[PDB]
Amino acid sequence: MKNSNDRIILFRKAGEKVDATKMLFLTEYGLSHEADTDTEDTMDGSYNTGGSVESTMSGTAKMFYGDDFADEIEDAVVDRVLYEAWEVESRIPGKNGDSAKFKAKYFQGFHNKFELKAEANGIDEYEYEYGVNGRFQRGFATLPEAV
């Protein structure tokens, strides 16, 4: 029942506490959690190994003139700086004193890939893959500039 465009997605570098921003012109956004469980056999039975889970998210968006954020991303993938991101679902506020902040998932990791693409007579599109680097926390977060 949720229209995708309700999902809002923010990033920022850990070092820059003050800095804040949002990703714009998403077309397709996809999160993923991949459980590595390969049971090794046993004579009396079988055991299901509990392996790490490399969660990651891939999003594609467009690239316009009044923004350079995507350039910061294609910078980070190379410089391999840390970032942290916020997958906040709007229209879902707090419960007691957190109404201004809507439900969100917070996770800190690196951008594992940047790939943009051009097409004659068309707007260029940049895709990014971000590795979450561990457990993703939950709670509520506040948007900037009321949008």
Residue 96's binding partner among its own copies, another protein, none (Cβ under 5 to 8 angstroms by kind) is another protein
Residue 80 DSSP class? T
Long-range contacts of 121-124 (CB under 8 A, 24+ apart): 123/62, 123/63, 123/64, 124/62, 124/63
Q: How far is the CB of 98 from another protein (least distance, A)?
A: 9
Name 45's Cβ contacts closer than 8 Å, sequence gap at least 6. Answer: none
Q: Which is nearer to its own copies, 41 or 145 (CB)?
A: 41
Site string for its own copies, 11-40 (x = CB under 8 A): ---------------xxxxxxxxxx-x-x-
**Residue 119 binds its own copies (CB under 8 A):** yes
Site string for another protein, 128-147 (x = CB under 8 A): -----------------xx-
DSSP-derived secondary structure for 57-83: EEEEEE--TT--HHHHHHHHHHHT-EE
- Extract the tokens encoding 113: 């890939």
Give the one residue of 41, 44, 96, 145 binding its own copies; rule: CB under 8 A: 41
In angstroms, the CA 141 to CA 145 distance is: 13
Q: Which residues bind its own copies (CB under 8 A)?
A: 1-5, 7, 26-35, 37, 39, 41, 46, 48, 50, 52-55, 62-66, 74, 77-80, 91-92, 109-124, 131, 133-136
